Amino acid sequence: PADRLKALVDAAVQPVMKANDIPGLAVAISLKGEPHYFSYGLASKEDGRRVTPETLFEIGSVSKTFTATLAGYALTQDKMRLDDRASQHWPALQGSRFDGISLLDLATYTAGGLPLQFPDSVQKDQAQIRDYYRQWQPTYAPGSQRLYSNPSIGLFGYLAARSLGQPFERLMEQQVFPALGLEQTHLDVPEAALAQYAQGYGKDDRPLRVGPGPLDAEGYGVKTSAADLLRFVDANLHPERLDRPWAQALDATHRGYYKVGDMTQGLGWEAYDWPISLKRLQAGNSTPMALQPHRIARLPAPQALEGQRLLNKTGSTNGFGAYVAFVPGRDLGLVILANRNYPNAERVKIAYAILSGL
Ligand SMILES: *[B@@]1([O])OC2=C(C([O])=O)[C]=[C][C]=C2[C][C]1[N]C(=O)[C]1[C][C][C][C][C]1
């Protein structure tokens, strides 16, 4: 059995790796509560380090699901509410347009046209981050247009930490990751763990690791391994396995709020009906969904993302490419971590091939 699944994953991953020149890749699969890991290639082409289920990858915007779990905790402890105006949790923003923007709009990228990235002139400094939001003028009315945005959900995470009374980075290290049982998950990789930190590769195989930037922790900062990230996936498949406060914090992120095409937007997670064709799942994770605006169709009420559904999230840095997906009704979870930023369509292709069947 374990040899037949290894042959499936190997048939799913190996062609895509060679086709995209991916130096190293790690797959972690959860089925019926049983873990399975599959390692391919090299974490470092220079020093010949091989990929293992403990290899640390940059998961990029998959971090947004962790940020959402943090926000989920604040909501369950009644320190904030999704319809709260943004400037309520940051007095410096009072008098700016964020007096009429809800946290939900920020969490779900519908504030009114916040861009993908902070301007290059905005540095990792609170005052510059403050000034940026203070002078920002909307392109659209709130809650009408989705524009994938790090400033948007980054502010969402930053305000969640404020409502809790501590910085975002500290709350993650000392509460979230320990509460989720994650010891191989970091925002700032300890010096003792750097040996497990895979090298990233891009155009011309120039080495690429992520550097500092405004609200980087909230938007795309997590580094973890396939095994540790699968622990997180399992925690999403079985929130009851955690203490009550953190079970409710994960269930909070399993709530859909509006649709765009086949994709239902939750907190961090993006959901699809299952089964669904590969082309449609690829279309939902394609570049236009990240760089271009889209009108939304709001659901009459929060829709639980449970049952025959596929929750997922992509993640890309300059040198890494991750994809996470799980299916509640099937009790199946999947993690694909790679040290090259290769097309999301290819990430979904690997995941879809594996999911095909059982
Ligand atoms: B994030 O990784 O999500 C993302 C994706 C995706 O979902 O796969 C695709 C294109 C852009 C983004 C934005 C996020 N990534 C970053 O902001 C990244 C930019 C380069 C430097 C490190 C952070």
Q: Which residue has the tokens 């790690």?
A: 26
**Atom 18 in ligand 1: which residue has the minimum CA distance?**
317
The 10 Å Cβ neighbour count of residue 173 is: 16
| Cα–Cα distance measured from residue 22 to residue 283, given in angstroms and rounded to the nearest whole number | 22
Task: Count CB neighbours of 193 within 10 A.
Answer: 15
CA of 31 to the centre of ligand 1 (A): 29
C-alpha to C-alpha distance for 350 and 280, rounded to whole angstroms: 15
- Report which secondary-structure segment, H or E, holds 39: strand 34-41
Between CA 349 and CA 126 the distance in angstroms is 40
Ligand 1 geometric centre to CA of 316 (Å): 5
Write the DSSP string, 292-311.
S-EE-EEEEEEEE--SSEEE
Resolution (Å units): 2.2
| Cβ atoms within 10 Å of 243's Cβ, excluding its own | 10
d(CA 201, CA 281): 26
- 205, 16 in Cβ contact below 8 A? no
Q: Is 28 helix (H, G, I), strand (E, B) or coil?
A: strand
CA distance 59 to 335: 10
Q: Are 78 and 53 in contact (CB under 8 A)?
A: no
CB 247 within 8 A of CB 234: no
With a 6 Å cutoff on the Cβ, whether 67 touches ligand 1 is no
Instruction: With CA atoms as reference, report the closest residue to 52 among 66, 64, 39, 67.
Output: 39
| 262 Ramachandran zone, left/alpha/beta (phi>0; psi -120 to 50) | alpha
Cα dist. 52→16, 218, 335 in Å? 19, 26, 13
**Cβ 61 under 6 angstroms from ligand 1:** yes
Residue with the smallest CA separation from ligand 1 atom 12 is 316
SS3 165: coil
Q: How far apart are CA 33 and CA 53, in angstroms?
A: 17
CATH number belonging to domain 1-358: 3.40.710.10
Whether residue 275 is preceded by a cis peptide bond, meaning omega within 30 degrees of 0, is: yes
Instruction: Determine if ligand 1 sits within 6 Å of the CB of residue 286.
Output: no
Q: Give the residues across from 41 on adjacent strands.
A: 24
Are β-strands 321-327 and 263-265 bridged in parallel, bridged antiparallel, or unpaired?
Answer: unpaired
Dist. CA 10 → ligand 1 center (Å): 27
Active site residues: 61, 148
**Residue spans of beta strands (DSSP E) within 186-296:** 223-225, 255-260, 263-265, 270-273, 294-295
Pocket test for ligand 1, best of 270, 316, 320 (most atoms within 8 A of CB): 316
Domain boundaries, the chain: 1-358
Distance 295 CA to ligand 1 centre (A): 21
Beta-strand ranges (E) seen in 59-204 are 145-146
Residue 120: other Cβ atoms inside 10 A: 7
Interacting residues of 135 by C-beta distance below 8 A, sequence separation 6+? 96
Residue 230: name the closest of 181, 161, 296 by CA: 181
